[PDB]
């Protein structure tokens, strides 16, 4: 009977996971090689990308971990006895 | 199956390899082995472990 | 009390050291230097033979490999936890407990 | 260009492999699995 | 600073070979030495970390 | 700080199971009728086992 007027606070937790933003038109997973990746707009020319993040602060220095998931494929060919040679290809962001 | 699935001759199942040279620094160390796969044998790298 | 011979509740498997098998009392099995010890199955060793222990226990590597092969055909392409539907209540890997 | 050669697109593992290898692979599937050692492109 | 320490004495490499019959193993390795049947793997995560 | 020098003991437990030793060449379960059981060496003659 003597409860006081109150406000509400809402928040959520999400551990052991990464925020994912697929690079597809409808944000669906229809294959590893997404449709936008095969689009001719990005296939021919180059583009400069800048991203701005807005986060709530804390009182200690922190790091922003960003993963540009790409195709990382290695192919190993062994023609003769006791000789092994490989080729690496990571596209985009190739070394 | 009875034939062409496994050998009947003498052949070791597991093998142990001793390092041929070991170099140690203050905060790390390096070990080298001469992994020799015998003839008429195939080694799956997933089986190996230090 | 409970009768292990009938209901299959065994609790003394951890009390074996060696098993030697031979036919005609002259030819050993499996032979062909398949195992590290080419004459007998060594279930477990003391601290002396630590060079052949595995899984942070006193159970030797070859015996562990044999048990995994016998139950789930695992070991020729790297050990890993078998599927939950393949290791039932009486399976080996379910009731294996390392302690130190 | 190089995507096919790195198996990023094009035919899957059951095609570019020699038929003898594919024939041998399925026979000993439960003995010595080799399917997990070849890529299979999944293009949307 | 708390005095924890660790020292390595010996290190060995283990590997297990499937006792496949010689004739089948010889054909398998000979057929695997073709450029068309080269093995290939890809990273599960497959990402560049900044 | 005042810990004493100590030795280690290791053991294990395995209940509700039986030690299994298959009678096959590679300890694999390739069928109920194992290959060694079909071998002609044991099919023709008799052997005393201890």
Curated annotation (Swiss-Prot), chain C:
Site feature Involved in interaction with pre-protein VI, where: 75
Localization in the cell: Virion; Host nucleus
Domain of life of the native organism: Viruses
Gene induction: Expressed in the late phase of the viral replicative cycle.
Subunit structure: Homotrimer. Interacts with the capsid vertex protein; this interaction binds the peripentonal hexons to the neighboring penton base. Interacts with the hexon-linking protein; this interaction tethers the hexons surrounding the penton to those situated in the central plate of the facet. Interacts with the hexon-interlacing protein; this interaction lashes the hexons together. Interacts with host dyneins DYNC1LI1 and DYNC1I2; this interaction might be involved in intracellular microtubule-dependent transport of incoming viral capsid.
Function: Major capsid protein that self-associates to form 240 hexon trimers, each in the shape of a hexagon, building most of the pseudo T=25 capsid. Assembled into trimeric units with the help of the chaperone shutoff protein. Transported by pre-protein VI to the nucleus where it associates with other structural proteins to form an empty capsid. Might be involved, through its interaction with host dyneins, in the intracellular microtubule-dependent transport of incoming viral capsid to the nucleus.
Other remarks on this protein: All late proteins expressed from the major late promoter are produced by alternative splicing and alternative polyadenylation of the same gene giving rise to non-overlapping ORFs. A leader sequence is present in the N-terminus of all these mRNAs and is recognized by the viral shutoff protein to provide expression although conventional translation via ribosome scanning from the cap has been shut off in the host cell.
Record family assignment: Belongs to the adenoviridae hexon protein family.
Name of protein: Hexon protein
Residues of the full protein shown: 703 to 802 of 952
From Swiss-Prot, chain F:
Expression triggers: Expressed in the late phase of the viral replicative cycle.
Compartment list: Virion; Host nucleus
Other noteworthy facts: All late proteins expressed from the major late promoter are produced by alternative splicing and alternative polyadenylation of the same gene giving rise to non-overlapping ORFs. A leader sequence is present in the N-terminus of all these mRNAs and is recognized by the viral shutoff protein to provide expression although conventional translation via ribosome scanning from the cap has been shut off in the host cell.
Complex and partners: Homotrimer. Interacts with the capsid vertex protein; this interaction binds the peripentonal hexons to the neighboring penton base. Interacts with the hexon-linking protein; this interaction tethers the hexons surrounding the penton to those situated in the central plate of the facet. Interacts with the hexon-interlacing protein; this interaction lashes the hexons together. Interacts with host dyneins DYNC1LI1 and DYNC1I2; this interaction might be involved in intracellular microtubule-dependent transport of incoming viral capsid.
Function description: Major capsid protein that self-associates to form 240 hexon trimers, each in the shape of a hexagon, building most of the pseudo T=25 capsid. Assembled into trimeric units with the help of the chaperone shutoff protein. Transported by pre-protein VI to the nucleus where it associates with other structural proteins to form an empty capsid. Might be involved, through its interaction with host dyneins, in the intracellular microtubule-dependent transport of incoming viral capsid to the nucleus.
Protein family membership: Belongs to the adenoviridae hexon protein family.
Protein name listed in UniProt: Hexon protein
Residue window of the full protein shown: 853 to 902 of 952
């Amino acid at each position: 009977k003597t409860a006081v007027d109150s406000i509400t606070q809402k928040k959520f937790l999400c551990d052991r996971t990464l925020w994912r933003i697929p690079f597809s038109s409808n944000f669906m997973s229809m294959g590893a090689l997404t449709d936008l990746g095969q689009n001719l707009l990005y296939a021919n020319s180059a583009h400069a990308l800048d991203m701005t993040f807005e986060v709530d602060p804390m009182d200690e220095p922190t790091l922003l971990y960003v993963l540009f998931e790409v195709f990382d494929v290695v192919r190993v060919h062994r023609p003769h006895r006791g000789v092994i040679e490989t080729v690496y290809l990571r596209t985009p962001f190739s070394a | 199956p009875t034939h062409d699935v496994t050998t009947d001759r003498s052949q070791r199942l597991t093998l142990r390899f001793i390092p041929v040279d070991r170099e140690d620094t203050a905060y790390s160390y390096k070990a080298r082995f001469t992994l020799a796969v015998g003839d008429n044998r195939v080694l799956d790298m997933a089986s190996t472990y230090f | 009390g409970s009768i292990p011979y009938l209901d299959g509740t065994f609790y003394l498997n951890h009390t074996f050291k060696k098993v030697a098998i031979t036919f005609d009392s002259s030819v050993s099995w499996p032979g062909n230097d398949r195992l590290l010890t080419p004459n007998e199955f060594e279930i477990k060793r003391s601290v002396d033979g630590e060079g052949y222990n595995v899984a942070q226990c006193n159970m030797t590597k070859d015996w562990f490999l044999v048990q995994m092969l016998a139950n789930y055909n695992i070991g020729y392409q790297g050990f890993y936890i078998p599927e939950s539907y393949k290791d039932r209540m009486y399976s080996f890997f379910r009731n294996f407990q390392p302690m130190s | 260009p190089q995507w096919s050669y790195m198996h990023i697109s094009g035919q899957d593992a059951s095609e570019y492999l020699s038929p003898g290898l594919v024939q041998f692979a399925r026979a000993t599937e439960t003995y010595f699995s080799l399917n997990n050692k070849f890529r299979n492109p999944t293009v949307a | 600073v708390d005095g924890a320490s660790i020292k390595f004495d010996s290190i060995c490499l283990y590997a297990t070979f499937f006792p496949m019959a010689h004739n089948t193993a010889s054909t398998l390795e000979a057929m695997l030495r073709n450029d068309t049947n080269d093995q290939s793997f890809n990273d599960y995560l497959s990402a560049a970390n900044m």
